[PDB]
Structure 1
């Protein structure tokens, strides 16, 4: 069986992610936000979510600090997010996806664009001359309905895997998702969290949905 980890990511702050691949004007945004280029709808890359979740979860596990490569995590993190060390290679149980902006109609209901420009500057400490920059940034309260595929390979380890997954989401609630996070952006939260089967049925599906629905 494979399981699908359905949910949504709601933004409490800006969450500027990414770099185009677009030309810039000389009075407009530098470093614009990354977009799904067919629809020009803002996007969370699955690589960003996977990397931040992996870093936070392998910071909590390995209690304290981590200073090593991704191949030197414990077997929970290696079995959850893949590995590439030379002989003890482990296929990733989790498959993330590119997350498009999902509630565009409810953003347009309040009569505003899907993104914003946030004006910044920096002052030189000796000459007090400012240096403005403009960053494109997604507006707060933007929801991102995501889904993550889980590969049910060992039925006696799925309890610890979903415990670790809920641990990683609960850590990522108290941290930014990408870009200028320490300077007041990126703070997200996780809602509508559930797990469903791909095809068939998993026997203890309720013990996974309860460990994520709290």
Structure 2
């Protein structure tokens, strides 16, 4: 049995994922439709970092293969014997609200100008940062496959923990300097094929 967890990532401040024309530091985008994109690798990595740091005694210093059983069963592993298949399955997230952004007569991304005033020179050496704008939304869905009936409650508690841990941190790029602040909303879980018995408890421990 498999479950799908669907929500929205709304950008409270600007965001800037990725890099590598005649301009400095572009964002990583969709390659066909040129939409700004959250890579699912970046969302999975930041969620894994925050959830592994909170599901621990404070801080997190070891390799991702050496995490707790909840983290390793939620995000996968690669060992010579203790290899596990991940239960979460993240996806690349394209920009959903181009209609909402295009209503306000603003581009989906914009260029941020900022200096580095050297102290002994007091001269600007300016640089351009492309940022997808604030108020942008990103509809995601993560596929959760159910293997243990007695562990789906703890797995979903950890998933909600990772969500509201990411609500108090940023998502990629120059984050401490203004960028990256996100927030999660419209969080729900649905079943892929054939209804789970305990779906209401998951919608109420994930809808809070």
TM-score (norm 1): 0.95
Question: Which runs of 5 or more structure 2 residues have no equivalent in the other structure?
Answer: none
Measured after TM superposition, the shift of residue 28 of structure 1 is 5.6
Q: Deviations over 1:78-103 (max 9, x none)?
A: 00000012210110000000000001
Distance 1:82 1:182, change over 3 A: same
Structure-2 residue corresponding to 1:107: 101
Tell me how many residue pairs correspond in the alignment: 207
Q: Deviations over 1:170-203 (max 9, x none)?
A: 0100000000000001000000000000111100
Which residue of the other structure, out of 191, 195, 205, is the alignment partner of 2:189? Answer: 195
Structure-2 residue corresponding to 1:11: 11
Question: Which runs of 5 or more structure 1 residues have no equivalent in the other structure?
Answer: 20-26
Q: Deviations over 1:42-77 (max 9, x none)?
A: 110000000000000000011201100001100000
Misfit runs of 4+, over 3 Å: none
Name the CA distance, whole Å, in 1 between partners of 2:190 and 2:111. Answer: 38
TM-score (norm 2): 0.97
Name the CA distance, whole Å, in 2 between partners of 1:151 and 1:131. Answer: 51
1:29/1:136 contact within 8 Å kept? no
1:29/1:135 contact within 8 Å kept? no
